Design a protein around this ligand. Structure first.
Ligand SMILES: Nc1ncnc2c1ncn2[C@@H]1O[C@H](COP(=O)(O)OP(=O)(O)NP(=O)(O)O)[C@@H](O)[C@H]1O
Ligand SMILES: Nc1ncnc2c1ncn2[C@@H]1O[C@H](COP(=O)(O)OP(=O)(O)NP(=O)(O)O)[C@@H](O)[C@H]1O
Ligand SMILES: C[C@H](c1ccc(CC(=O)N2CCN(c3ccc(C#N)nn3)CC2)cc1)C(F)(F)F
Ligand SMILES: C[C@H](c1ccc(CC(=O)N2CCN(c3ccc(C#N)nn3)CC2)cc1)C(F)(F)F
Ligand SMILES: [Mg+2]
Ligand SMILES: [Mg+2]
Lengths: 352, 352
């Protein structure tokens, strides 16, 4: 059978697929036609149907896995389209995680003789994260940070070594947010979570602006001015609130200037998109900061697809975590940030 | 001069006014006409102009303050209308707090010979809170909780003794949120804050529903179903997420079902109002929970006018804090919740 791992989230399905590249002449003969059709389909296309995408830039080349050499591919599509995926499959051992491994268990079993093995979504996340960092991103660092995140003329992506990664606070920004404390390879806990996550950004942005995609929401946000919607400290105090070290530019009330009808009539969709992004991102960083202080962990890594093609939120997190922590916490990011659960599921294959 | 304290917030001005009731015959003679006009105006009206309100039910009767007996009155109006207030004043020592004490300092000084004394908004909050609890609410408890907050057929308001109130976590829900740790009458700190406060509720609700007042937003929310907009754990898992004790009814992603166009087309304004209220209230409780755990404080008191005439948010806080704390934290509420800064400012009068 082909080697897959799948993470079925509330919004996106993530699939990790190992393509063997050491197939012998005899193995190619014994390779059944349906299986050759799937490998050729997956490796000769980068778009699958109307909504599946292979993230070619993330491919790990010439990886040794389970004693074979191959390429590790990263594929995503909306969970809304999982029925199409299963129907094509109906036209094999599947290790699957995320809530959808449970929700759609009966649907996967419509594939005759398919063996579904449900694995825990945060177990798989930790295992996949640690594995990908260990093997490297084709010899480059998997983990990075933004150096000098408070100075835009200096701020730049730089590699970060995770060779001894414990302890680590992992902030998984999906539909919602889960916060994990990782103390060892076998000692981790879910500290808490928040409901204000990527689904809040996308849902509120769609309601407020009429955008029809994540990418459109980000493009709108890139053009907006969140201070047209937000009430700042200087709007209330006339300046800094010196006594408690609050700068005048800090947001006192997200969307707080929208209590005034005339301001609601002048605000642009782009302003609202940017205010939504800033509101969600600052809340995530603040919750991460509080959890890091309580867990006594100073390295905070952010994962999940809220941050894919989202440099604005990444740089806001990098700046805000450093600023509000007075430099005590460091924001870390990973190149394969949305796919760790799917990789961790694939890594469960030998147990079955 | 009349005895006032004023808290000029980002949204509302709160005024505490001490009406002497022990005026002698000789004092009444020496009482200048403008001053009698103000006392009669304040005590014979409950609405002032088009936007000022006296909260008559909060009046403290026959209070002894600064060696005189009198009634303590509680009055509020929008900060947007402070120019009207100052203009009428132009037609005396003012102790003032909130950001507006700084922002509008020059405007108060247009009142000839007026002495403005700016006092810190969180100093005044702590002093006013401790004072009002100490004198009682006309012999009744100032502080209350919701007994059996998880069982609607049992849940009921009950008095709570704060005779030894330390330590205490104070959550001030105004335009934004400030979280205070109070260790003694002279030892308190601002732990942190969040930008997702009462102004976020009102501003987002106005954008999403077209409501034109706080009270209208609450009325809409009372009729709505937040689960039409929110994505729940059971929407992702099909049920509970047993491994981490997350019930299926918990919100996984606030507004997360609004990423689907057909759901945006079916959701009602009332549903959106309720989702906004639930989103903001749960975030406040969660941040309060994390701060209480870090500060090692088990009593959490919620103040500010986000909760005025807002039993929905109060009961949600009471239930959520108890539930997610596994009964380790208690949500507390105060009858005079919006006015403590104004009282604390009034209490600064003897220092000048
Ligand atoms: N193409 C896309 N379509 C939808 N959302 C996207 C897309 N790209 C990025 N996003 C964002 O990524 C979020 C989903 O991230 P992801 O980590 O895949 O969550 P999930 O696993 O599907 N949800 P969960 O069940 O809570 O773990 C969305 O809420 C968006 O903010
Ligand atoms: N009549 C009202 N008008 C406006 N907002 C109201 C009203 N009644 C209750 N509210 C709510 O109360 C909040 C303001 O509470 P309040 O404690 O008075 O804040 P503030 O002091 O004006 N702001 P801040 O400068 O941040 O401390 C608003 O954001 C609303 O959610
Ligand atoms: C005094 C009062 C008020 C001011 C400010 C705030 C908001 C606030 O205190 N903060 C601090 C924490 N902050 C973040 C952000 C990102 C990260 C990370 N990563 N961490 N913390 C958010 C804003 C509330 C009330 C008002 F009168 F001026 F309105
Ligand atoms: C697993 C993942 C997910 C589930 C749930 C959540 C949200 C979450 O974890 N919580 C816990 C803390 N919680 C509150 C609320 C109020 C108070 C008080 N007072 N305290 N805590 C908010 C919700 C995120 C992600 C998903 F796959 F199912 F999506
Ligand atoms: Mg996920
Ligand atoms: Mg205030």
């Amino acid at each position: 059978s082909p080697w897959f791992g799948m993470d079925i989230g509330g919004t996106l399905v993530k699939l990790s697929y190992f393509e063997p590249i050491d197939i012998t002449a005899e193995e190619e003969q014994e390779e059944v036609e349906s299986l050759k059709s799937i490998r050729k389909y997956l490796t000769s296309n980068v778009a699958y149907g109307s909504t599946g995408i292979r993230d070619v830039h993330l491919e790990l080349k010439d990886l040794t896995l389970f004693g074979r050499r191959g390429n590790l591919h990263f594929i995503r599509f909306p969970t809304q389209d999982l029925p199409t995926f299963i129907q094509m499959g109906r036209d094999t051992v599947l290790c699957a995680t995320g809530g959808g491994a449970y929700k759609f268990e009966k649907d996967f079993r419509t594939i005759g003789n398919l063996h579904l093995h449900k694995l825990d979504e945060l177990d798989c996340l930790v295992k996949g994260l640690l594995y990908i960092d260990s093997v490297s991103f084709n010899g480059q660092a998997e983990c990075y940070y933004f150096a000098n995140a408070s100075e835009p003329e200096r701020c730049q992506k730089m590699p970060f070594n995770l060779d001894d990664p414990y302890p680590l606070l992992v902030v998984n920004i999906g539909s919602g947010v889960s916060i994990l404390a990782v103390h060892s390879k076998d000692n981790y806990k879910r500290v808490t979570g928040t409901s204000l996550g990527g689904g809040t950004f996308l849902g509120l942005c769609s309601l407020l602006t009429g955008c029809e995609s994540f990418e459109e929401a980000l493009e709108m946000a890139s053009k907006g001015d969140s201070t047209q919607a937000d009430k700042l400290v200087r709007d209330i105090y006339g300046g800094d609130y010196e006594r408690f070290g609050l700068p005048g530019w800090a947001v006192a009330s997200s969307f707080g200037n929208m209590i005034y009808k005339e301001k609601r009539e002048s605000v642009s969709k782009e302003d609202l998109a940017r205010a939504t992004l800033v509101t969600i991102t600052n809340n995530i960083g603040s919750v991460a900061r509080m959890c890091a202080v309580n867990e006594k962990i100073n390295r905070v890594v952010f994962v999940g697809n809220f941050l894919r093609v989202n440099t604005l939120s990444m740089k806001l997190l990098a700046y805000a975590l450093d600023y509000w922590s007075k430099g005590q916490l460091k924001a870390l990011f990973l190149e394969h940030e949305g796919y760790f659960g799917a990789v961790g599921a694939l890594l469960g294959l030998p147990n079955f």
